[PDB]
């Protein structure tokens, strides 16, 4: 399946598009928040009804921001996962090239190159694994109140 090269690329473009939308939305949200908190302090005097409508609007903004920021955090890890998966796929293809050649025809430099690519491949799997462990330690961390 070279289907998976194309699927990985499309998923990466899709996530980048969503990341661009979240960045714009957080920018808007922070400006709206700044505006309403200036209103509440400057109009230290206006109807309590309109004040509680402004605090209500800052509480809905607060929840929308938390949602956006948490979605953004998940997507940023997925971007790095797809980036590692693509590098792993590149070494897999190179190493598969070396391995499908007759051993009679391999110089000493060829065999050393083949070994080096194998060690880089294994290290990329270990890098993907470190990302799993980063998520696990954040899960343990976020449970702490």
């Amino acid at each position: 399946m070279k289907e998976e090269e194309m699927k990985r690329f499309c998923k990466a473009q899709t996530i980048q598009r969503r990341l661009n939308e979240i960045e714009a939305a957080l920018r808007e949200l922070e400006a709206e928040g700044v505006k309403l908190e200036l209103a509440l302090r400057r109009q230290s005097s206006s109807p309590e009804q309109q004040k509680k409508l402004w605090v209500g609007q800052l509480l809905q903004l607060a929840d929308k921001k938390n949602s956006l920021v948490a979605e953004e955090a998940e997507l940023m890890i997925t971007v790095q996962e797809l980036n590692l998966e693509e590098k792993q796929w590149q070494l897999d293809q190179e190493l598969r090239g070396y391995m499908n050649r007759e051993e009679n025809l391999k110089t000493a430099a060829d065999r050393q190159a083949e070994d080096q690519v194998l060690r880089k491949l294994v290290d990329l799997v270990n890098q993907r694994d470190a990302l799993i462990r980063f998520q696990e330690e954040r899960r343990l961390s976020e449970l702490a109140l």
Partner: protein, 171 residues
């Protein structure tokens, strides 16, 4: 967004269907072309068991002997290990004894072990009777399923049964 992370590991001779067994579990598809696993790999699959979202990190080893020292460094982290042979390949099953010895040597003492006889869709070409599998599992006191990645027989059941054994001792 998930409750628990479980580390699983598939081992067994090259060609028994380890990568296919995983691809059926994680993508409900089957590929007939043999692409031999180079060194080591893993996939992620999240499942729901007893109201818990469990994140499965399933390590897939190369069965070829040149990759042996690479694969042995991943035994110690495993919480469950599927030992896979091919019901049409006699030597794959006689090698189950050796794979069990590798677990004795490199894996945590309390690892959950499960025996899978894959390719159970090729009854016409069976060499290993289901009862030999049953008997060796009984001798080691471990679970045994006959599986098929091609026909989707007992794949989900094997993985979720092993995950439930890990979960049942989690507290």
């Amino acid at each position: 967004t998930y409750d628990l992370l479980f580390k699983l590991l598939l081992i067994g001779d090259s060609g028994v269907g380890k990568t296919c067994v995983l691809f059926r579990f994680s993508d409900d598809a089957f590929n007939t072309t043999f692409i031999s696993t180079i060194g080591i790999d893993f996939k992620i699959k999240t499942v729901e068991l007893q109201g818990k979202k469990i994140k499965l990190q399933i390590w897939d080893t190369a069965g070829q002997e040149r990759f042996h020292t690479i694969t042995t460094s991943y035994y110690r982290g495993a919480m469950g290990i599927m030992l896979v042979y091919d019901i049409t390949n006699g030597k794959s099953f006689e090698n189950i004894s050796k794979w069990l010895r590798n677990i004795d040597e490199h894996a945590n003492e309390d690892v959950e072990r499960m025996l899978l006889g894959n390719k159970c869709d090729m009854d016409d070409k069976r060499v290993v009777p289901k009862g030999k599998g049953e008997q060796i599992a009984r001798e080691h006191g471990i679970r045994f399923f006959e599986t098929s990645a091609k026909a989707n027989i007992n794949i989900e059941k094997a993985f979720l049964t092993l995950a439930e054994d890990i979960l049942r001792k989690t507290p």
